[PDB]
Amino acid sequence: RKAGISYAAYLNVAAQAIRSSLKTELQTASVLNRSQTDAFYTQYKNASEPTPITK
Amino acid sequence: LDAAVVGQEHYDVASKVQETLQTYKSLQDIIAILGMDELSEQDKLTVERARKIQRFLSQPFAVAEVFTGIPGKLVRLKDTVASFKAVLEGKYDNIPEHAFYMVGGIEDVVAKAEKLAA
Amino acid sequence: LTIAEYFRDEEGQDVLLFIDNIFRFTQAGSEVSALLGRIPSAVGYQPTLATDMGLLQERITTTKKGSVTSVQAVYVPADDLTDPAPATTFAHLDATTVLSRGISELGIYPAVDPLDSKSRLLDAAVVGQEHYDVASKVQETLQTYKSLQDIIAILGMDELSEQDKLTVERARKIQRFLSQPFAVAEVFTGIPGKLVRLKDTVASFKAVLEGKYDNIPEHAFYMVGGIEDVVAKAEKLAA
Amino acid sequence: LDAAVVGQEHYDVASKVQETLQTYKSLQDIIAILGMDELSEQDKLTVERARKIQRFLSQPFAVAEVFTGIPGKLVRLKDTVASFKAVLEGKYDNIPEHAFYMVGGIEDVVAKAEKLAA
Amino acid sequence: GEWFRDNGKHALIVYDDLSKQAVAYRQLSLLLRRPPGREAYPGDVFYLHSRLLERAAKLSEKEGSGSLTALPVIETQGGDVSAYIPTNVISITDGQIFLEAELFYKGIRPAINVGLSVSRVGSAAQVKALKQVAGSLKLFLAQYREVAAFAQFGSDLDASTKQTLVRGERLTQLLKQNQYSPLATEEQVPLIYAGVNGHLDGIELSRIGEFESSFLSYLKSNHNELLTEIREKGELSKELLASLKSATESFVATF
Amino acid sequence: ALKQVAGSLKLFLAQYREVAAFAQFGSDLDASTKQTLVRGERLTQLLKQNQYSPLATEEQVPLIYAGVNGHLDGIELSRIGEFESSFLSYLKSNHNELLTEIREKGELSKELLASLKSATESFVAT
Amino acid sequence: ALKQVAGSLKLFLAQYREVAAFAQFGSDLDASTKQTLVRGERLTQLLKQNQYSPLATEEQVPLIYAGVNGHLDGIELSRIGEFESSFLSYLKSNHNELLTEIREKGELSKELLASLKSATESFVATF
Amino acid sequence: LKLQFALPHETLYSGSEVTQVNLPAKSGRIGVLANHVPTVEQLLPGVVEVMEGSNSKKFFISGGFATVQPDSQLCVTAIEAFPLESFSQENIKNLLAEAKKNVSEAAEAAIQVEVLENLQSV
Amino acid sequence: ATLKEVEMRLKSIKNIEKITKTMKIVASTRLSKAEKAKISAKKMDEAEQLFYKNAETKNLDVKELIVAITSDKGLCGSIHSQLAKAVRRHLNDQPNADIVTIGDKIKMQLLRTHPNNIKLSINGIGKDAPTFQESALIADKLLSVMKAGTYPKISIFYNDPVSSLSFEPSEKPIFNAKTIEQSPSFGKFEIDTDANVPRDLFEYTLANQMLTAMAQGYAAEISARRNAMDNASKNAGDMINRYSILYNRTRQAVITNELVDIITGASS
């Protein structure tokens, strides 16, 4: 997973599995909050610079 | 504005156009206090649709050309119904903000959206 | 007013006069005034709003021969307490009784609001330092209870400062204790009504305000008369 | 209040004082409800300046000595302009606001500012 | 209408509307130069309407038990119910049905504002069968108002209040109605019963209407005995209730 | 010659307050909003005018083209005053061609506007 | 005599009640004007009056002297009414010579001002 | 042995005395003795069995880290940890297996395969 | 002056007063939620930092990366402003740092003052309670687009929720792969020299301790919004009472004046 991702991502990828294969019966309100994010990122120079991609 | 008088399809379109626009007016104290980000994913969609709808009601009149410069457009009733139904059913959610504004029928809306590329 | 007056002047009683609704006495005065053709005054009321009130309210007083006490239903135009109608009326008021669907919705009868209702006579020189002191403390206790409800509703009963959970527990008692079964209401309720004499009321609540009956269950104080009926009721609750 | 009766220099000072005081007025309710914490940093500054300005326009009156408890001052027109020009130029932002309360000209502010030091 | 009321018969009178009559009354008076009052109405504009509306009454046994029931109508300006004439009449009648243009455009029709509407007679003149299933509905819709405009920005939803939104949106949608399509009470109670008892929480909102439809005719074909008993007794027995629970769930599952 | 440079200048100043009330509850400024706020702040400013001081139409026309077409946006808001007096003194010397053309024919050609495009860019770096 | 001991109390209280308005926090408890917040509550307490208790002008200035100058910033808020009756009785018996001089002079000489001063700290040490 | 089992969201064991903890370090299954040597090991996904004498609660684990302190403490830090009593009634594992690995996006869809076909090994 | 104007002013005030008195309660709905993720956060701090405590890990002195945490959502007293303070205070002792801003209000607070420094910016944040998935990806992008693991120092900035009534802007270090090795007591541990434990533990820690800051900063904010709306809806309530007097007067003088106008119109 080199020339590529990181230990923590590489760990989050497996972390979704536990949550998304816990029976819906108790996949809870707070539990789904953990399994998706709304975050975006925009790089900067001097005022803004490049594009605002999703995460 | 009665199904008996105008045809069921007509009235059904006309009513949802009002319901849609009544939601946008109810949501405005929210967007003012919590932005667009706070809206329900379906509310976000309904807000996006209403903007197009509210601009699709803009019409260049003929007598008005001495103000707008734009040639006066005249839309037929069946076009209108079929046009606002299409936009309701999400078939134009990709076409830009300005495209729907100050034109005639749905045909004209396509012409605006394209010419905003060159 | 005249009928009840006779009972003071001739039978020498303490008489009760209900007027329901006194505001309607004002708007009729206003109607007659208008029709006669008298220039209307502020907000359209009759130029004689105050003296019209006087010729009535003044007749309601205590004389050497007896008294006439008036319980007056007061409508308040537009919820505006400064409107000439209620403004004029209030000048003649010695107390208020506020029945409330807020109290009602708690199953507390009669539905008097213990905070809202007010008496120009809840004063040491009139009631005596005895009465007044229990009176204030009930009002202070029930008051801090009301203000803390926000945190009781979302932070649980657990998170009150050491003394506050004792006042709320006592306030909850006092709150129930303030309900009463009525003798008239029997034919709909079944529960035997109780005329609680004042001396008993003060003492019964003084006793609670000292915490002598902290142990006694809460459902007990509810729909009984004076203190003994709590003792009686609490002791049927084990059986 | 024209530049060609009072001087352009005199005119400009009072103008911006008014600008400032109208901005503090334009925010009065935002503040009264939500406090200083919800204001952009520009605004927050023009409010800190205007609050000084508003107290600086209050003056001990000779005839009002019985009410003030303070000796009465009679600032000169030329004095008044220069003083307020300086405050507009930011020269006295660090100084306590209360040093501006009930004084004469600019020198009285500093004179009293030190009285408020120790 | 009184001819009926006086002879042990029942008339319903609709005054459409008393806003316009009051204007007409003002017209005479201003023109006869009779003394004017607030908003130039005659000093007794109140009595014009209270004289009229007290004539609607239910009568004693000794007098025929005849009844005149009045449905007066007042138009408001911008919903302002504190206006001179509206308040006059609001204070005369035994209750309001306040309709709101807000709700109207939303699609909620009739646009009854549950908050500002009452029947001061209350239950005493509701079909017991209906009072049985329907009771406290107005109060739920009450708390549902608050919470819905408290979930507006509250995206944090405890299963308690979120579930209560579902009950709210369903009862609200059930109470929508086409014009000129009044229902019988024996059609109304089985419909409200399903609603209040959560049987509708599972069904998605867009199909509440088609539910009313299939459920009624299903009940008509299959569970007709229940409806007949609702109509002839206007009460619900514990057996009659059990039959209603069953037939609801029987249908709900099949659709 | 005024109508042409002043098209939708009123409708634009109308969409400017609309965005100024969006920034009233101060949030992040994007490609659209940070553009029109900075623009409209400078037109509002440009339409400030001293009393007892009317301007000829050949004076109004360049100033409005200067403002509307976007040659004022990178200039400090506080300096537009001196821009008015300075850009006019500049135009009176060199581009006197433009001003007496604009005065007389009252219109604008595709050629005249081309020269007005130049002169304004030609005075941007002082 | 009153005017002299009341020095900027009028102007003070309006300042205190304004300070106590910005006292909404809380997480920002000040050390500076927090002492005017004590004075205030002390002086507020002092001016409170039972109906039908009009005190003589001589019974007034000692109380106000104790407030203004600050011989009250230590005393608890629930015992200022006590301090009042306790301090009048004390003066009535002990320093009656002052109470008679205030009534008859109408002024306060520095000799009578320092005389009051002493009797104030004297009573403060004992409460 | 003392234990701090910590998650971002939940906090299972804090300070208390579990007698033996089993772990999945990289290429090493550790059963941490009551007095083990100071180690810092990376926890692959797997079962973290805590033994409290005659007891054991397994937890399937997202990943994380384990460190044995010089005071013989065990610090097991993970993202997700659930007791087996209600871990999984779904069974859309194979719905991800062939879904990921069959796509040649490329960098991470292939990366999401490596774990799933390993996770359900019990 | 006009009943219309007073009618509108009374409505927009009472409306504001619903907005704020509900955000006050939407906060308390979220208040218990805030203590879950708050202690759980401080709990892993005790668990995950105790290694570094024991390894005596400190900054190699051999160019900083500063990470500021707040939110996109305002109306929370001085959460944003006084973290910006403490970050500027810090930017005096080392001006040349790169700034990564998480949350839109700290972005523009800091964009006002040091617009050259900010070099990456994370959006759509304050909305829920913070998560590892968020953290880890922002972490991943920090490694990728920012080259975090080349920095002599890395700093996290957040507000630490001291009480329910007050908060405190604090700062914490993240040590990189090299810095973990050259710690004095790193040898005390029998880390298997095989895998770069120092690389992976850094990457894991960077993500892990951003989430701790996020969970904490989040909690303090909720309390700031609870308290700010506590004050706002009390001021608004106070305005309402005043204006309800002004409405009621204008209500009446408008009835009086119309009537005088009418009554005058028949003076003849």
UniProtKB/Swiss-Prot annotation, chain A:
Gene3D superfamilies: ATP synthase, F1 complex, epsilon subunit superfamily, mitochondrial. GO terms for molecular function: proton-transporting ATP synthase activity, rotational mechanism. GO terms for cellular component: mitochondrial inner membrane; mitochondrion; proton-transporting ATP synthase complex. One of its GO terms (biological process) is proton motive force-driven mitochondrial ATP synthesis. Signal peptide: none annotated. Its main location: mitochondrion. Keywords: ATP synthesis, CF(1), Hydrogen ion transport, Ion transport, Membrane, Mitochondrion, Mitochondrion inner membrane, Phosphoprotein, Transport. Pfam families: ATP-synt_Eps. CDD domains: F1-ATPase_epsilon. It comes from the Eukaryota. InterPro entries: ATP_synth_F1_esu_mt, ATP_synth_F1_esu_sf_mt. It is found in: Mitochondrion; Mitochondrion inner membrane. Mitochondrial membrane ATP synthase (F(1)F(0) ATP synthase or Complex V) produces ATP from ADP in the presence of a proton gradient across the membrane which is generated by electron transport complexes of the respiratory chain. F-type ATPases consist of two structural domains, F(1) - containing the extramembraneous catalytic core, and F(0) - containing the membrane proton channel, linked together by a central stalk and a peripheral stalk. During catalysis, ATP synthesis in the catalytic domain of F(1) is coupled via a rotary mechanism of the central stalk subunits to proton translocation. Belongs to the eukaryotic ATPase epsilon family. This is ATP synthase subunit epsilon, mitochondrial.
Swiss-Prot record, chains B, D:
F-type ATPases have 2 components, CF(1) - the catalytic core - and CF(0) - the membrane proton channel. CF(1) has five subunits: alpha(3), beta(3), gamma(1), delta(1), epsilon(1). CF(0) has three main subunits: a, b and c. The chain holds residues 391 to 508 of 511 of the full protein. It is found in: Mitochondrion; Mitochondrion inner membrane. This is ATP synthase subunit beta, mitochondrial. Belongs to the ATPase alpha/beta chains family. It comes from Saccharomyces cerevisiae (strain ATCC 204508 / S288c). Mitochondrial membrane ATP synthase (F(1)F(0) ATP synthase or Complex V) produces ATP from ADP in the presence of a proton gradient across the membrane which is generated by electron transport complexes of the respiratory chain. F-type ATPases consist of two structural domains, F(1) - containing the extramembraneous catalytic core, and F(0) - containing the membrane proton channel, linked together by a central stalk and a peripheral stalk. During catalysis, ATP synthesis in the catalytic domain of F(1) is coupled via a rotary mechanism of the central stalk subunits to proton translocation. Present with 164000 molecules/cell in log phase SD medium. It comes from the Eukaryota.
Swiss-Prot record, chain E:
It comes from the Eukaryota. It is found in: Mitochondrion inner membrane. Mitochondrial membrane ATP synthase (F(1)F(0) ATP synthase or Complex V) produces ATP from ADP in the presence of a proton gradient across the membrane which is generated by electron transport complexes of the respiratory chain. F-type ATPases consist of two structural domains, F(1) - containing the extramembraneous catalytic core, and F(0) - containing the membrane proton channel, linked together by a central stalk and a peripheral stalk. During catalysis, ATP synthesis in the catalytic domain of F(1) is coupled via a rotary mechanism of the central stalk subunits to proton translocation. Changing G1D: In ATP1-2; growth-defect. F-type ATPases have 2 components, CF(1) - the catalytic core - and CF(0) - the membrane proton channel. CF(1) has five subunits: alpha(3), beta(3), gamma(1), delta(1), epsilon(1). CF(0) has three main subunits: a, b and c. Belongs to the ATPase alpha/beta chains family. The record marks S117 as: Required for activity. This is ATP synthase subunit alpha, mitochondrial. The chain holds residues 291 to 545 of 545 of the full protein. Present with 41500 molecules/cell in log phase SD medium.
Curated annotation (Swiss-Prot), chain H:
One of its GO terms (cellular component) is mitochondrion. The keyword Nuclease does not apply. GO terms for molecular function: proton-transporting ATP synthase activity, rotational mechanism. It is found in: Mitochondrion; Mitochondrion inner membrane. F-type ATPases have 2 components, CF(1) - the catalytic core - and CF(0) - the membrane proton channel. CF(1) has five subunits: alpha(3), beta(3), gamma(1), delta(1), epsilon(1). CF(0) has three main subunits: a, b and c. Its main location: mitochondrion. This is ATP synthase subunit delta, mitochondrial. Belongs to the ATPase epsilon chain family. Transmembrane segments: none annotated. It comes from Saccharomyces cerevisiae (strain ATCC 204508 / S288c) (Baker's yeast). The chain holds residues 32 to 158 of 160 of the full protein. GO terms for biological process: proton motive force-driven ATP synthesis. Keywords: ATP synthesis, CF(1), Hydrogen ion transport, Ion transport, Membrane, Mitochondrion, Mitochondrion inner membrane, Transit peptide, Transport. It comes from the Eukaryota.
